[PDB]
Design a protein around this ligand. Sequence first.
Ligand SMILES: *[C@H]1O[C@H](CO)[C@@H](O)[C@H](O)[C@@H]1O
Ligand SMILES: [Zn+2]
Length: 167
Amino acid sequence: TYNGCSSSEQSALAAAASAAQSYVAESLSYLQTHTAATPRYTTWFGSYISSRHSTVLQHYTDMNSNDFSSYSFDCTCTAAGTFAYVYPNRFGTVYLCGAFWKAPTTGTDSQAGTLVHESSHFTRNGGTKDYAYGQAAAKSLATMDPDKAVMNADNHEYFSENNPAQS
Ligand SMILES: *[C@H]1O[C@H](CO)[C@@H](O)[C@H](O)[C@@H]1O
Ligand SMILES: [Zn+2]
């Protein structure tokens, strides 16, 4: 369901959720077939180790079971700089803010990527935290502290967005 959303916002969210679902599905597939270090995995989750890969894999396996199209959206947040927020223990409800709207559907820091970001926040999906914000910061975190990177919402979004595309 939707709360305080316009017609434009509802359709943008439907497509965003559908694009998010596709992001998570391919990311899951990718993780199941790529069992060694690749530029895409290491850029976002740092040095390749099975234990961290299992954690990101589980995150995606759980996120994959999520039905993004059944999520409850709330568009009452007008904070111009914030994309969206969620309560880790209040599953399926995503509150969208101002910045979310000016973002593209897919791509870098997109609406669909934001859903992957927020979704990974749910304790049921793995409960990521907000350690670093942005590609610059996310990549740094992945080279400075892989453990945090695998528990960072943005690093999940960027691995899924994969833009610039890496193999
Ligand atoms: C993460 O590290 C790997 C090397 O193991 C590269 O494939 C990638 O470019 C990134 O630096
Ligand atoms: Zn977050």
